[PDB]
Amino acid sequence: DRSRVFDILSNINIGWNLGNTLDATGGGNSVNAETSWGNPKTTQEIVDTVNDRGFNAIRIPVTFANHLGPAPEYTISADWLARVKEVVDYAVNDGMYIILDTHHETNYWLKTDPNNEAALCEELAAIWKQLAEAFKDYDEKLMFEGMNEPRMAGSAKEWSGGTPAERKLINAMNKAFIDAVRATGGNNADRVLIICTYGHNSDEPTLKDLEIPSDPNIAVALHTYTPYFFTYVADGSYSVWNGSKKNDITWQYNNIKKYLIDKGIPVVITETGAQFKENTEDIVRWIGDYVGTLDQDGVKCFIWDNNIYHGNGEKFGLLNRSLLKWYNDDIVDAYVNHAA
Ligand SMILES: [Mg+2]
């Protein structure tokens, strides 16, 4: 029975990612990494604003690599650990549901070479042991997500669920993550731990090869920016949403129900969203079809928000953090009022 995890997740309206922030990789071994991709330093007020709008869950992506000491201890720089804790505490201060992950480790040490399994598992465990210790006394609203889109960057199947060998490696890494956290005890004994597929991919072969831990306090995370050609800008992309492509969402969701939901495994969509293409009305309709599909089985999602809206880049921005005002209240309304 995994009902405790379902109970905790049911308290979430919809979630929000503090993107391009603690996950940013500039600045070297410095707290300045946080602002290295152009976002302002996070404040209590920024977090309050997210909560107040109706996003009562926040995902805090963090890239640790540059703040780590040498193997085998991989000691997290004290200044960085303290700053990560400060940001998590903004959310705890507001009684929010929280996901803390490791993030762009994939730029550094987290390269899914099956021949390097031991070193990979050991580094992931060494990092999570330290995080679990730091947050050992935190309550059940704080969840850990072991990895983010773990893959081999540049590989042929980087974004299609990788290879069978890589997927076995992911299973091993998910276990190492769970094992390291549970070993620290305290509230970490039953904290919700969120494992993932290769690249957070949700294609059938990827789901089919996913090992499900016997640990009853886990959830499986996926990233479904579906359809890719609506949500991203690429040759072949479109900004119009009239429902004709809803099938792309339905098909994929059916594989998620087949392999996870209908088996009683908790699923969380820890990233999704649609880049702004001067198509407010279309995104509002897509949200209805996409989030409405997840709502059928009470699956929760967290929206990616990188604070990019007017400028160049992937325009996932929703909250203008400097002004504490939302870039687009119609899109934001559709998200937070999804259950209405
Ligand atoms: Mg306890």
CSV table of C-alpha atoms and ligand atoms in Angstrom, one decimal:
chain,number,residue,atom,x,y,z
A,1,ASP,CA,0.0,0.0,0.0
A,2,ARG,CA,1.4,3.3,-1.1
A,3,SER,CA,-1.6,5.4,0.0
A,4,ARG,CA,0.4,7.7,2.3
A,5,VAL,CA,2.2,9.1,-0.7
A,6,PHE,CA,-1.1,9.6,-2.5
A,7,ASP,CA,-2.5,11.4,0.6
A,8,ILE,CA,0.5,13.8,0.8
A,9,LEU,CA,0.3,14.6,-3.0
A,10,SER,CA,-3.5,15.2,-2.8
A,11,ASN,CA,-2.8,18.4,-0.8
A,12,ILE,CA,-1.1,20.0,-3.8
A,13,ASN,CA,-3.1,22.3,-6.1
A,14,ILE,CA,-0.4,22.8,-8.7
A,15,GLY,CA,3.3,23.3,-8.4
A,16,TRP,CA,5.9,25.8,-9.6
A,17,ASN,CA,9.7,25.5,-10.4
A,18,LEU,CA,12.2,28.1,-9.3
A,19,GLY,CA,14.0,27.6,-12.6
A,20,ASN,CA,17.4,28.9,-13.8
A,21,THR,CA,18.2,29.8,-10.2
A,22,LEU,CA,20.0,27.4,-7.8
A,23,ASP,CA,20.2,25.1,-10.9
A,24,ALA,CA,22.3,27.7,-12.7
A,25,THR,CA,25.9,26.6,-13.3
A,26,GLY,CA,27.9,29.9,-13.5
A,27,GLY,CA,29.8,31.4,-10.6
A,28,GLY,CA,32.0,28.4,-9.8
A,29,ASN,CA,32.1,27.4,-6.1
A,30,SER,CA,30.1,30.4,-4.9
A,31,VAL,CA,26.6,31.3,-3.8
A,32,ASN,CA,26.7,33.7,-6.8
A,33,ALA,CA,25.8,30.7,-9.0
A,34,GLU,CA,22.2,31.6,-8.1
A,35,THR,CA,22.2,34.8,-10.1
A,36,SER,CA,24.6,33.6,-12.8
A,37,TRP,CA,21.9,33.0,-15.4
A,38,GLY,CA,20.4,36.5,-14.8
A,39,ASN,CA,17.8,35.9,-12.2
A,40,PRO,CA,17.6,38.0,-9.0
A,41,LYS,CA,18.5,36.4,-5.7
A,42,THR,CA,15.5,34.5,-4.4
A,43,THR,CA,13.6,36.2,-1.5
A,44,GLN,CA,10.9,35.2,0.9
A,45,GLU,CA,8.6,37.6,-1.0
A,46,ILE,CA,9.2,35.8,-4.3
A,47,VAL,CA,8.2,32.5,-2.7
A,48,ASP,CA,5.2,34.1,-1.0
A,49,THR,CA,4.0,35.4,-4.3
A,50,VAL,CA,4.0,32.0,-5.9
A,51,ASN,CA,2.1,30.5,-2.9
A,52,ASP,CA,-0.4,33.3,-2.7
A,53,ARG,CA,-1.3,32.9,-6.4
A,54,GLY,CA,-2.3,29.3,-5.8
A,55,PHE,CA,0.9,27.3,-6.5
A,56,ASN,CA,1.2,25.8,-3.0
A,57,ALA,CA,4.0,23.4,-4.1
A,58,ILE,CA,7.4,24.5,-5.2
A,59,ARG,CA,10.2,22.6,-6.9
A,60,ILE,CA,13.7,23.9,-6.1
A,61,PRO,CA,16.1,22.7,-8.7
A,62,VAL,CA,19.7,22.8,-7.5
A,63,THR,CA,22.9,22.0,-9.3
A,64,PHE,CA,25.5,20.9,-6.8
A,65,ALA,CA,28.5,19.9,-9.0
A,66,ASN,CA,30.6,23.0,-8.8
A,67,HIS,CA,30.0,23.3,-5.1
A,68,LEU,CA,31.3,19.8,-4.3
A,69,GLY,CA,34.7,18.9,-2.9
A,70,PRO,CA,36.8,16.1,-4.4
A,71,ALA,CA,35.7,12.5,-4.5
A,72,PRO,CA,35.0,10.4,-2.5
A,73,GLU,CA,33.4,12.7,0.1
A,74,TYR,CA,32.0,15.2,-2.4
A,75,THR,CA,31.5,17.6,0.5
A,76,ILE,CA,29.0,20.3,-0.3
A,77,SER,CA,30.5,23.7,0.3
A,78,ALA,CA,29.0,25.0,3.6
A,79,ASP,CA,28.0,28.3,2.1
A,80,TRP,CA,26.1,26.6,-0.7
A,81,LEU,CA,24.3,24.1,1.6
A,82,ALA,CA,23.3,27.0,3.9
A,83,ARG,CA,21.9,29.0,0.9
A,84,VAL,CA,20.0,26.0,-0.4
A,85,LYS,CA,18.5,25.6,3.1
A,86,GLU,CA,17.6,29.3,3.2
A,87,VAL,CA,15.6,28.9,0.0
A,88,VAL,CA,13.9,25.7,1.1
A,89,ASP,CA,13.0,27.5,4.3
A,90,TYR,CA,11.2,30.3,2.4
A,91,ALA,CA,8.8,27.6,1.4
A,92,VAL,CA,8.7,25.9,4.8
A,93,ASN,CA,7.9,29.3,6.3
A,94,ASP,CA,4.7,29.3,4.1
A,95,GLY,CA,3.7,25.7,4.8
A,96,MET,CA,4.3,24.7,1.2
A,97,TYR,CA,4.8,21.3,-0.4
A,98,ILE,CA,8.4,21.2,-1.6
A,99,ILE,CA,10.6,19.2,-4.0
A,100,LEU,CA,14.4,19.5,-3.6
A,101,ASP,CA,16.3,17.8,-6.5
A,102,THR,CA,19.8,17.6,-7.9
A,103,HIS,CA,19.7,19.2,-11.3
A,104,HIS,CA,22.3,19.9,-14.0
A,105,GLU,CA,24.7,17.3,-12.5
A,106,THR,CA,24.3,15.9,-16.0
A,107,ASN,CA,26.6,18.7,-17.3
A,108,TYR,CA,29.4,17.4,-15.0
A,109,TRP,CA,29.6,14.0,-13.4
A,110,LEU,CA,26.2,12.5,-14.0
A,111,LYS,CA,26.9,10.9,-17.4
A,112,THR,CA,25.0,7.7,-17.8
A,113,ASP,CA,27.8,5.4,-18.9
A,114,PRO,CA,26.8,1.9,-17.7
A,115,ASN,CA,30.5,1.0,-17.3
A,116,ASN,CA,30.9,3.7,-14.6
A,117,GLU,CA,28.0,2.5,-12.4
A,118,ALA,CA,29.9,2.3,-9.2
A,119,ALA,CA,31.4,5.9,-9.3
A,120,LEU,CA,28.0,7.2,-10.4
A,121,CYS,CA,26.0,5.5,-7.6
A,122,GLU,CA,28.6,6.5,-5.0
A,123,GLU,CA,28.7,10.2,-5.9
A,124,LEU,CA,24.9,10.4,-6.0
A,125,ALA,CA,24.7,8.6,-2.6
A,126,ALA,CA,27.4,10.9,-1.1
A,127,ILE,CA,25.6,14.0,-2.1
A,128,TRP,CA,22.2,12.7,-0.9
A,129,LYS,CA,23.6,11.6,2.4
A,130,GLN,CA,24.6,15.2,3.1
A,131,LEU,CA,21.3,16.7,1.9
A,132,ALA,CA,19.3,14.1,3.9
A,133,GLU,CA,21.3,14.9,7.0
A,134,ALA,CA,20.8,18.7,6.6
A,135,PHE,CA,17.0,18.3,6.1
A,136,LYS,CA,16.5,15.3,8.4
A,137,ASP,CA,14.2,17.2,10.8
A,138,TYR,CA,11.9,18.6,8.0
A,139,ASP,CA,8.3,17.4,7.9
A,140,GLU,CA,6.5,15.4,5.3
A,141,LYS,CA,5.8,18.4,3.0
A,142,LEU,CA,9.5,18.3,1.9
A,143,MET,CA,10.1,15.6,-0.7
A,144,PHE,CA,13.5,14.7,-2.4
A,145,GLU,CA,13.8,14.1,-6.1
A,146,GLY,CA,17.1,12.2,-6.7
A,147,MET,CA,18.0,13.3,-10.2
A,148,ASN,CA,16.9,15.5,-13.1
A,149,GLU,CA,16.7,14.1,-16.6
A,150,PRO,CA,19.7,11.7,-16.0
A,151,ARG,CA,21.1,10.9,-19.4
A,152,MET,CA,24.2,11.0,-21.6
A,153,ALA,CA,24.2,14.4,-23.3
A,154,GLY,CA,25.0,14.2,-27.0
A,155,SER,CA,24.0,10.5,-27.3
A,156,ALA,CA,21.6,9.4,-30.1
A,157,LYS,CA,18.8,8.5,-27.7
A,158,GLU,CA,19.5,11.3,-25.1
A,159,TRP,CA,15.9,12.5,-25.4
A,160,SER,CA,14.2,9.2,-26.3
A,161,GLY,CA,14.7,7.3,-23.1
A,162,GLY,CA,18.3,6.2,-23.8
A,163,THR,CA,19.4,2.6,-24.2
A,164,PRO,CA,18.4,-0.6,-22.3
A,165,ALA,CA,21.8,-0.6,-20.6
A,166,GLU,CA,21.4,3.0,-19.5
A,167,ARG,CA,18.0,2.2,-18.2
A,168,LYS,CA,19.3,-0.5,-16.0
A,169,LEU,CA,21.9,2.0,-14.7
A,170,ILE,CA,19.1,4.4,-13.9
A,171,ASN,CA,17.4,1.7,-11.8
A,172,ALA,CA,20.6,1.2,-9.9
A,173,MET,CA,21.0,4.9,-9.3
A,174,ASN,CA,17.4,5.3,-8.1
A,175,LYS,CA,18.2,2.5,-5.5
A,176,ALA,CA,21.4,4.2,-4.4
A,177,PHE,CA,19.5,7.4,-3.9
A,178,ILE,CA,16.7,5.8,-1.9
A,179,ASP,CA,19.3,3.7,0.1
A,180,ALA,CA,21.4,6.7,1.0
A,181,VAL,CA,18.5,8.8,2.2
A,182,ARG,CA,16.8,6.1,4.2
A,183,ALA,CA,20.1,5.3,5.9
A,184,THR,CA,20.2,8.8,7.5
A,185,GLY,CA,17.0,8.0,9.5
A,186,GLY,CA,14.9,10.6,11.3
A,187,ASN,CA,12.1,12.0,9.2
A,188,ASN,CA,14.0,10.7,6.2
A,189,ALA,CA,12.8,7.2,7.1
A,190,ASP,CA,9.4,7.8,5.4
A,191,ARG,CA,9.9,11.1,3.4
A,192,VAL,CA,8.5,10.9,-0.1
A,193,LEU,CA,11.4,10.1,-2.4
A,194,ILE,CA,10.9,10.8,-6.1
A,195,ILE,CA,12.7,8.5,-8.5
A,196,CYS,CA,12.8,9.0,-12.3
A,197,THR,CA,13.1,7.4,-15.7
A,198,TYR,CA,16.0,8.0,-18.1
A,199,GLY,CA,15.8,11.6,-19.0
A,200,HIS,CA,12.5,11.8,-17.2
A,201,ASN,CA,11.2,10.3,-20.5
A,202,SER,CA,7.7,8.7,-20.6
A,203,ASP,CA,7.9,6.6,-23.8
A,204,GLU,CA,6.6,3.1,-23.4
A,205,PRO,CA,10.0,1.3,-23.6
A,206,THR,CA,11.3,3.7,-21.0
A,207,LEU,CA,8.4,3.0,-18.6
A,208,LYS,CA,8.6,-0.7,-19.3
A,209,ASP,CA,12.2,-0.9,-18.1
A,210,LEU,CA,11.6,1.1,-14.9
A,211,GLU,CA,12.2,-0.8,-11.7
A,212,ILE,CA,9.6,0.0,-9.0
A,213,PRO,CA,11.2,0.0,-5.5
A,214,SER,CA,9.4,-2.0,-2.8
A,215,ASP,CA,9.9,1.1,-0.6
A,216,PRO,CA,6.2,2.3,-0.1
A,217,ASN,CA,7.1,5.9,0.3
A,218,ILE,CA,8.3,6.7,-3.3
A,219,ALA,CA,6.8,8.4,-6.4
A,220,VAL,CA,7.9,8.3,-10.0
A,221,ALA,CA,8.6,11.6,-11.7
A,222,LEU,CA,8.3,12.3,-15.4
A,223,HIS,CA,8.6,15.4,-17.6
A,224,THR,CA,5.8,15.8,-20.1
A,225,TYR,CA,6.0,19.0,-22.1
A,226,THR,CA,3.5,17.4,-24.5
A,227,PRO,CA,3.2,18.0,-27.4
A,228,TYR,CA,6.8,19.0,-27.8
A,229,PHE,CA,6.0,21.0,-31.0
A,230,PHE,CA,3.5,23.1,-29.2
A,231,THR,CA,5.5,23.7,-26.0
A,232,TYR,CA,8.9,24.3,-27.5
A,233,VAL,CA,10.3,26.3,-30.4
A,234,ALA,CA,11.8,24.1,-33.1
A,235,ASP,CA,11.5,23.6,-36.9
A,236,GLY,CA,8.1,22.0,-37.1
A,237,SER,CA,6.7,23.8,-34.0
A,238,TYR,CA,3.3,25.5,-33.9
A,239,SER,CA,1.6,28.1,-31.6
A,240,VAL,CA,-2.0,27.1,-32.3
A,241,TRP,CA,-4.0,24.9,-30.0
A,242,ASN,CA,-7.4,23.7,-31.2
A,243,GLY,CA,-7.6,20.3,-29.7
A,244,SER,CA,-6.5,18.3,-32.8
A,245,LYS,CA,-3.3,17.3,-31.1
A,246,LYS,CA,-4.9,16.4,-27.8
A,247,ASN,CA,-4.3,12.8,-28.9
A,248,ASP,CA,-0.5,13.2,-28.4
A,249,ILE,CA,-1.3,14.0,-24.7
A,250,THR,CA,-3.9,11.2,-24.3
A,251,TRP,CA,-1.7,8.5,-25.9
A,252,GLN,CA,1.3,9.3,-23.7
A,253,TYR,CA,-0.9,9.6,-20.6
A,254,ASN,CA,-2.4,6.1,-21.4
A,255,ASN,CA,1.1,4.6,-21.2
A,256,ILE,CA,1.6,6.3,-17.8
A,257,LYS,CA,-1.7,4.9,-16.6
A,258,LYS,CA,-0.8,1.4,-17.9
A,259,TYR,CA,2.6,1.2,-16.3
A,260,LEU,CA,2.3,3.3,-13.2
A,261,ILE,CA,-1.1,4.8,-12.2
A,262,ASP,CA,-3.3,1.7,-12.7
A,263,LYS,CA,-0.6,-0.3,-10.8
A,264,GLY,CA,-1.1,2.1,-7.9
A,265,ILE,CA,2.3,3.8,-8.2
A,266,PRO,CA,2.2,7.5,-7.4
A,267,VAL,CA,3.3,9.7,-10.4
A,268,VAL,CA,4.3,13.3,-10.3
A,269,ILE,CA,5.0,15.5,-13.3
A,270,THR,CA,7.8,17.5,-12.0
A,271,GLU,CA,8.2,19.7,-15.1
A,272,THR,CA,5.9,20.8,-17.8
A,273,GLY,CA,4.8,24.1,-19.4
A,274,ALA,CA,4.5,25.9,-22.7
A,275,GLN,CA,6.8,28.6,-24.0
A,276,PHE,CA,5.0,31.9,-24.7
A,277,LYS,CA,4.5,32.4,-28.4
A,278,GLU,CA,2.2,35.5,-28.3
A,279,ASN,CA,-0.5,32.8,-28.1
A,280,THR,CA,-2.2,33.4,-24.7
A,281,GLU,CA,-5.5,31.9,-25.8
A,282,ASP,CA,-3.9,28.8,-27.2
A,283,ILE,CA,-1.8,28.1,-24.1
A,284,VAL,CA,-5.0,28.6,-22.0
A,285,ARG,CA,-6.7,25.9,-24.1
A,286,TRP,CA,-3.7,23.6,-24.0
A,287,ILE,CA,-3.6,23.9,-20.2
A,288,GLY,CA,-7.2,22.7,-20.1
A,289,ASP,CA,-6.5,19.7,-22.2
A,290,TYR,CA,-3.2,18.8,-20.6
A,291,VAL,CA,-3.8,19.5,-16.9
A,292,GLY,CA,-7.3,18.3,-17.3
A,293,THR,CA,-5.9,15.0,-18.5
A,294,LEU,CA,-3.8,14.7,-15.4
A,295,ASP,CA,-6.7,15.7,-13.1
A,296,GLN,CA,-8.5,12.5,-14.2
A,297,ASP,CA,-6.4,10.5,-11.8
A,298,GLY,CA,-5.4,13.4,-9.4
A,299,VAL,CA,-1.9,13.5,-10.9
A,300,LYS,CA,-0.1,16.7,-9.9
A,301,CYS,CA,2.3,18.8,-12.0
A,302,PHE,CA,4.9,21.5,-11.4
A,303,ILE,CA,5.2,24.2,-14.0
A,304,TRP,CA,8.7,25.2,-15.3
A,305,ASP,CA,9.3,28.9,-14.7
A,306,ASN,CA,12.7,30.4,-15.7
A,307,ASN,CA,11.7,34.1,-15.5
A,308,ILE,CA,12.1,34.6,-19.2
A,309,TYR,CA,9.2,36.2,-21.0
A,310,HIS,CA,10.1,39.4,-22.9
A,311,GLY,CA,13.7,38.7,-23.6
A,312,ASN,CA,15.5,36.1,-25.8
A,313,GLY,CA,15.5,32.5,-24.6
A,314,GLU,CA,12.9,29.8,-23.8
A,315,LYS,CA,9.9,31.9,-22.7
A,316,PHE,CA,8.6,29.7,-19.8
A,317,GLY,CA,8.5,32.8,-17.5
A,318,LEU,CA,5.3,33.3,-15.5
A,319,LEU,CA,6.3,35.3,-12.4
A,320,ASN,CA,8.2,38.5,-13.0
A,321,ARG,CA,10.3,38.1,-9.9
A,322,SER,CA,11.7,41.7,-9.8
A,323,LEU,CA,8.2,43.2,-9.8
A,324,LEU,CA,6.3,40.4,-7.9
A,325,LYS,CA,3.7,40.6,-10.7
A,326,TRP,CA,2.8,37.8,-13.2
A,327,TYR,CA,3.8,38.2,-16.9
A,328,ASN,CA,0.5,36.8,-18.1
A,329,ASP,CA,-2.5,36.5,-15.7
A,330,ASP,CA,-4.6,34.5,-18.1
A,331,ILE,CA,-2.1,31.7,-18.4
A,332,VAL,CA,-1.5,31.8,-14.7
A,333,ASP,CA,-5.2,31.7,-14.0
A,334,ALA,CA,-5.7,28.6,-16.1
A,335,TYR,CA,-3.0,26.8,-14.1
A,336,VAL,CA,-4.0,27.7,-10.5
A,337,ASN,CA,-7.7,27.4,-11.2
A,338,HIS,CA,-7.3,24.1,-13.1
A,339,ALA,CA,-9.5,22.2,-10.6
A,340,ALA,CA,-12.3,24.7,-11.0
B,1,MG,MG,9.3,9.7,11.8
